[PDB]
């Protein structure tokens, strides 16, 4: 997260980490046994890391679950990012408690100009380099369709919005990947791909998490 601030400790209750020997790529709670995160985030080996802070520091929080099974959404193009979205299954329930909690889904898809809490240990300079230890967070605006369309010419599908701010220094960057867009307490978006990071006029892109609620519901109850 570039232009954000330090969220505080497990004040995102629904963020996890992905761990594979190290953090690579946020998700979302939904329930005690499902995880939400990118498609482009897929790799064997999954740990999900719930309860945390500081990524590096056992703080006393932490509930460490590997990943029973992975499921790619059906239609996930890793060349365009169409369907940037998959389920991870923990191989036994985490235990919910003020700090480790899902995050409801939604009824219906948000609107351009509301204002959503997107969090993540990615990168927080645009120029450069830099890995938090603890969590950061952005608050950030949806934008419309036709300003994301007109960002990226080509490059936008029904199944993306775009959220942050045009003028640059405010964005999600790479290390969020997977990580949460949380408007009005629903998972809305999933942090996927942009230009650079926080540069002007190529805000940050989402994938549009209300597309996919029936897919999710059906895969939870037969998996
Ligand atoms: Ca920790």
Known sequence: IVGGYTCGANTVPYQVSLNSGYHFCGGSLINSQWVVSAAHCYKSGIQVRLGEDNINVVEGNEQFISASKSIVHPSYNSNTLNNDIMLIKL??????????????????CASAGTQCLISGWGNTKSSGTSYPDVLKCLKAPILSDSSCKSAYPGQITSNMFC?????????????????????????????????????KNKPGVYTKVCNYVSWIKQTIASN
């Open 91 to 108: 191989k036994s329930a985490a235990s919910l408690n003020s700090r480790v909690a899902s995050i409801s889904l939604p009824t219906s």
């Open 163 to 199: 959220a942050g701010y045009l003028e640059g220094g405010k964005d999600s960057c790479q290390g969020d990947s997977g990580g949460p867009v949380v408007c009005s307490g629903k998972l809305q978006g999933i942090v996927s791909w942009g230009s650079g990071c926080a540069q």
